[PDB]
Structures are given as structure tokens and as C-alpha cells.
Design a protein around this ligand. Structure first.
Ligand code: 3IB
Ligand code: 3IB
Lengths: 140, 140
């Protein structure tokens, strides 16, 4: 069976199954899943470009920009001009956004701890290191 | 930075970056990405239920059923009644579908080999084993 060991299919199924478990949580706290991805990606970060935000949130850039339009209207994020290149817009979370997402982030950490507990610390750290190295080799 | 080591974000970014590289290939061979997921998932498989196909292809079940409507019209797949429970429809690839996808599957294997080569055999097998165990623990 081709699909049983094919890496992209394994990554996509593991990602969908683990993420879908947290969806209910995010929505019960009043967040859409994409709002959660944006605010969790910006929490504790210096301002990043729209393109960087689109990559880390695995969301298409036009979709990200419409999302930021409403999140900025609600005071949860802010878009800012870039240092030199003004082809580039930066984005950051505001204090209001951080306060809105902090509890959900603790719940996310607890859920992640549960997902990783059966694997033990060595296998969990190996998995995270491999995924980080793959991202850094394939990001454009 | 919360997002830098958060497992679901790492899985989703690695999955999106690695899969998007093969999209161009699939389309140059005349496949949509979802047609590729269906035919690669059924290749070499006994008939599986629609719900199983939706899970392994990470596609919503109503979307899968519409996709199968057109793929079956093109003779690439076939839906069949289940053994006993006729709440359940099974689906299989046909010979025509297998012949249509076989070359693309070899290209997919080559791309996967390239993705995994820098990690070496031990780290690649550890990654695949961890992902398989996660899927089997979280599938519903
Ligand atoms: O959408 C993509 O580009 C592929 C995502 C990975 C993926 C998930 N399920 C699958 C079944 C067969 C082949 C690939 C997969
Ligand atoms: O869509 C989901 O349910 C989450 C997918 C995983 C994911 C991808 N990018 C992210 C950035 C912040 C938090 C979670 C993520």
C-alpha cells in the first residue's frame, strides 16, 4: 500500500488529526481557527511581514490580509510600515490581542503535552527537531 | 516565541511546504491535487469506506463524495456496496485509474527520497514511525 508509508500523507494526516482536536477549544473561547493561528503566531514576536505570517499560519496571503483587516478593526493586531522596503508591511499582536489569547495558549500547551507524553522526551524532541529542520530547508 | 516549537504548527508547516512542492508535478500530469490524493490512497488497496478515504486524504466527506462522482464518471474509481452494513459504501481504484497514476507515483517516491536524504535512514524511519503511531492514536 503506497499511502501507508508515504511521508507527505503521514505528515498531513498527523497534522489534521492533532490540530482538529484543538479546534473545539478555540471556538469555545470565541476564536475562529484562523484567528487562533494568527494570534498564536504573533504572541511574543517582534513585527513580521505579511508573507512570513502567511507562511507560519499556512494561510494564503490574500486570505491573511482580509483576516487582518477585521482583526485590526477589533484592535487585536496592528499593521506597520517596514524599516526601508515599503513593498513590505509588518504586523504585530497588540496588548489586547495578547490578553485575549493567553489562556487559550496555556490550553494549547497542555494539549500538546498530552499528545507528546506517550512518546517520551527523547522522541518528542527528535520529532520537533526534524520538523524544524525540514521547515528551514523547504521554506521559500 | 510560542509558535517556534509548538507541535501542531511545526507539523502543519512541514506538511504544507513538502506537499506544495509536488503540486506542480501532479498538475503537469493532468491531476488536481485532490484527484492525486484519492488515486494514490487507493492504489494497491482493497476497497475502503468513504469515511476511511476521507480520513486518509484529509478531505471532508461531502467533498470526497462529489470528487468520486466525477472520477467514477471517468472510469478511474468505482463505488461498491459493503459486505453487510449497507450504511457503508466502499470505493476502489480501477485498472484505468492505476495506469493513469503509476508514473506520478514513481515521481512521488523520488521526491520523497530527496526530502528524506539529508536526514539519513535512521532519522527518516524514526520520523515515519512516530507519525504512524500518532495517526493510529488520534484517528476516530
Ligand atoms: O494536498 C497535498 O498536496 C498532499 C497532502 C498530503 C496527503 C494527505 N493525504 C494524502 C493521500 C495521498 C497522497 C498525499 C496525501
Ligand atoms: O488549523 C489548525 O487547526 C492549526 C494548524 C497548525 C498551525 C499551522 N500554523 C499555525 C500557527 C499557529 C498555531 C497553529 C498553527
Amino acid at each position: 500500500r503506497f499511502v501507508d508509508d508515504y511521508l507527505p500523507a503521514l505528515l498531513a494526516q498527523a497534522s489534521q488529526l492533532i490540530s482538529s482536536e484543538f479546534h473545539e477549544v478555540a471556538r469555545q473561547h470565541g476564536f475562529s481557527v484562523s484567528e487562533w493561528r494568527v494570534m498564536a503566531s504573533l504572541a511574543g514576536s517582534e513585527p513580521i511581514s505579511i508573507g512570513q505570517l502567511a507562511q507560519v499560519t499556512v494561510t494564503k496571503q490574500p486570505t491573511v490580509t482580509r483576516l487582518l483587516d477585521r482583526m485590526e478593526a477589533r484592535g487585536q493586531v496592528e499593521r506597520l510600515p517596514h524599516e526601508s522596503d515599503r513593498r513590505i508591511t509588518l504586523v504585530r499582536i497588540t496588548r489586547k490581542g495578547l490578553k485575549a489569547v493567553e489562556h487559550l495558549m496555556e490550553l494549547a500547551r497542555e494539549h500538546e503535552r498530552r499528545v507528546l507524553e506517550p512518546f517520551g522526551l527523547r522522541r518528542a524532541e527528535e520529532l520537533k527537531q526534524t520538523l524544524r529542520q525540514m521547515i528551514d530547508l523547504h521554506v521559500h
